[PDB]
């Protein structure tokens, strides 16, 4: 068996959702911001936000909404986790003591169901009579909000329309009514139903179905003054309400897909719209009052306000202030002005909240020769792309290097006092027949530049037609100084060439230190690329020189230096090249039994291979023979995101289902076969998507640091900006910390009353397993924050083992010291 | 796909046993003894008639590729029966076969099994499997005797007399190389034909085509009387050579 | 020749790796030195010699040589380890079973979740599967181990069943005692849970019905660790075993012993409303509690869902791609 320890060094920073309301008091204006597994509660002021409370939940927050049922003084909070844990929460404050009340809770997962493509949707009735949930295709789940439903029991109504895009409850209806856009073979259509809690079924809805834009994406429930709904698409915005129908199709929105909406004026007169290029719009509902005294919708107008960060959620707060919640970049507070500035913008940034964004790749480098190690991460996407330099000093110090283009891979080349970074920028087919970039960025603002002139694929004769306006990716190798972080050089790769891998190393007997990039020719026609290049560069005297190129028949997904040789993964093959005295790459040996060799890692003459469906396969290079040998394979099938080698026997993996697992050699050499079974001894549900695993530590090492119980240090980066550390334990230390977890879970009150053991249980859609071999460091490190009575309650009847004293009782003060040492590992 | 398991009579002059100096009579006697050994052991163990025959068929085929001077018959027979049990899902433990073989064999005969009988037998399973080319499925005249008899309609007692007499002829042909010369379907017809002659029964009348004097041609296509007579001659020879007479 | 078996040595095939864990032994992959063909090999260990050659292997070596079907795995030949010359007693070498290698396995295609199954894919997959089963059932053989791992799919969309090791012959005119609980519990029929021991061919039908729904839900229908807990889940969906729906349930050994919490009603159509109508009818018939009322393989092939499927179009599923 294996024993390991997981700690969160930096919490998730990406904003996954945000709502406003009256949650902490019926009087204050609140802003609730949701980051993965984290809820932040703020109070809105005239200058900005006052933080008041932050809680963790044992689950990914999928639905977050505020509502106020008749009889309550203030808003209640509904949250549903991605594992279908539902709860209703209440804020309660007793002077200085702030706590969160679980008013109702339960798990709403159906034994039989098909998860929907557009994900979990949750909405609440304007009369707060019920909560609607769209969890599965063909089914609508209703939780009625009666006082007695403390377990959140619910029923399903059969839904004929199997593929639903979005749904909302409507305002101004005699009964609870849903308005939704759905897709069938005849296109996309909008439709309504009424929800009867008494009959537990749908009844005919208030207004008819109409054919709507093929890419209709979002549904807006317009408030009582207008009523009805607005449907947002790629080219058009439409208003629907019985007999009334409007459509505005302004050319400005066709340029970039709109992804978020919020209401500015409670009466529905004004809405905010955002798009994937960061533009912020105002949608205006022009009113016309008839002599009847009735108010109708005359027209719709769209006005461009300015640019924000690409935003997952928008929420207008008050006055001119808007909160911009960003998942791909830094979040913001911005002020909307009535008068435009001299550039034509009505939007002016107030504050910037750090978001490590998607961490595509990262490396650890000791820039200042301190013995510490700082983390340089490839963070953000598109305009928000950045390099982030992170050091410990009690908070983390983060520096931001704007790139304005998507960062892909990073590697440090000390000999050149610089980094190599792979980047991609979006250009659009223009009238010249070439392409034009939407904005300047790192690869265009380099001091010196070069473009690959390889003719290897130039024989072409394969047609790829271009239409004006289509997007294309331009990949470039950036040379960036380690002190100024200035782009010294940019190398632009061939047209339709994607860079997938990057290493910095010496090879063979060649004293020169090279940048080596593995690329793949990507054409929309190909399900999988069949052409690729390996390019060897030398950065010397401010210029990047192409040293050699090797054509491959596939995609160079990953590369790694192997004892003076170059180990590369091309499609279904893993290859080892030698670097000749003629400065060319030569095939030495191959391994072929992989579906897609996506990730690679080396220790000694051993190699770990990560496949799309075949999990992890342990290879070894056999020098006496000059070839590879299969050592062992994990027979449980998994979809890999990144792998790492912990030691000569233990191997770490990351699944696409937000799960972490550890494989080991079966350590029983009875039969050759037994060792060949890489047995998963560790299973853990991280709840975050790991892209990169990297050895190192950010803790300052003065050489005086007490040797911690934990041994080893693997840092990992995730999509939501969470950074974690995995380390190993002895059997004794595991058992102590494991037994303590079970004791802490009985003591610590969970938000929503979510069982911790369920939260960390391995979870794929098909299978679910209890966690094993892993210690939730955050649960252990929360011992220091629980009140003294609870601390002593935890240590009752707690015995140590395998120590200086075989059985040794624990006191509250003994454990406080142990955990405090464990907080120094990160 | 499937191997050919049938030879011509002329070919039996050239079995390994023949070419190592064994004369035709001795190999013939050696085959009867082994087949009857397989028959007697399994009957003592209570084995189904198909299981006995399958062992016997393996046995006969085996000594088409090997010599009786290098492979003692009784070990082979036991091995054939042992495997036949597992193939026909009437399994028996090897130790029980050895026990029964010892009861029926005198001391000289059981000397073939050597010091460790179980081990000498187990070593032969490997060769047997390779020799039979892993062709485990075997069809036997018994199933055809019954499939064809079911289609005869007439005096219930005369047909049952025909079946039992033919059934006995099948059991007796397992001591001969007919299993190696003709498919089981022909054997079933030949024994019906033989019993018909001996009981003075005209089988065509029982068939659906009573005026079709070659009654068998509706069961087995392309069989000349030449073949059925050759089979009958070979069957009655065993009776004339021995002291036993036709069952009637 | 092609008919000569047991003589060719394993030297001719070079071992690449170990593809997976099987029913009774781990499976490997190789290429012939003479032919580039990739194959699949299972090691038969005769070293125990408690009773010679394994009887279960003898079962697989008998049935497969008889079964010929596009949707049934073919055993190409049997090979051996190096044998000592003139030393038959000393020889301890083992035999291997040569099989056609398949590009993908349903267990790894579904577990990863990358694959996407449209209705038309499920149709082509089910039609081939049931046609193979109908072939084997028409030949009066019972598989008894229908599982995702034994289901294999080529990239082209051709499917074949694989490990026939646990399979045994079924006698219709006369019942015989068997080995009771056989199929993986997730896909085991209620009759085996209650110990019918003399199981009918419908045990395989129930399994394939569990597979059918699994394709639509992208999740196994019945997941448990305890036979009673499984019976609870089966009862919650297909209805609890009761004399009205299963007249002969009272004759089953554990009918009184093993009981669900409640007498649940059948909600199969309700819970599976999303499944298309043509398929839902197939599931209701395949997942019928009474083995006597449960549909046959032929009846599944003469269903609206599968009758009009043309095997010329094999609809390969969305096997993984590069942006994927
Ligand atoms: C008679 N018979 C035939 C077979 N057989 C033929 N091909 C296969 C086969 N290929 C799928 C596959 N595995 C891979 C491993 C690494 C890389 C690529 C892979 N592709 N998988 C399996 N299994 C064994 C149990 O685990 C999964 C299913 N069994 C097969 C077994 N018995």
Author numbering:
A (entry chain G): 1 to 393, 708 to 1140
B (entry chain I): 20 to 267
C (entry chain H): 715 to 1038
Pull text from the paper.
Recently, several unexpectedly diverse compounds were reported to deplete cyclin K by linking CDK12–cyclin K to the DDB1–CUL4–RBX1 E3 ligase. Here, to investigate how chemically dissimilar small molecules trigger cyclin K degradation, we evaluated 91 candidate degraders in structural, biophysical and cellular studies and reveal all compounds acquire glue activity via simultaneous CDK12 binding and engagement of DDB1 interfacial residues, in particular Arg928. Crystallographic dissection of 28 ternary complexes demonstrated that despite considerable diversity of the molecular glues, the overall complex architecture is highly similar. The low-affinity DDB1–CDK12 interaction primes the complex, while the ligand, through filling the kinase pocket and bridging over to DDB1, drives robust association, offering a rationale for the unusually broad chemical diversity observed.
To further explore the contributions of SR-4835 structural features to its activity, we evaluated various derivatives. At R1, an unsubstituted benzimidazole gluing moiety (DS55, (61)) showed a similar binding mode and only slightly impaired recruitment (EC50 = 36 ± 2 nM), while exchanging the benzimidazole for an indole (DS56, (62)) largely abolished activity (EC50 = 2114 ± 252 nM), highlighting the importance of the two hydrogen-bonding interactions provided by the imidazole moiety of SR-4835.
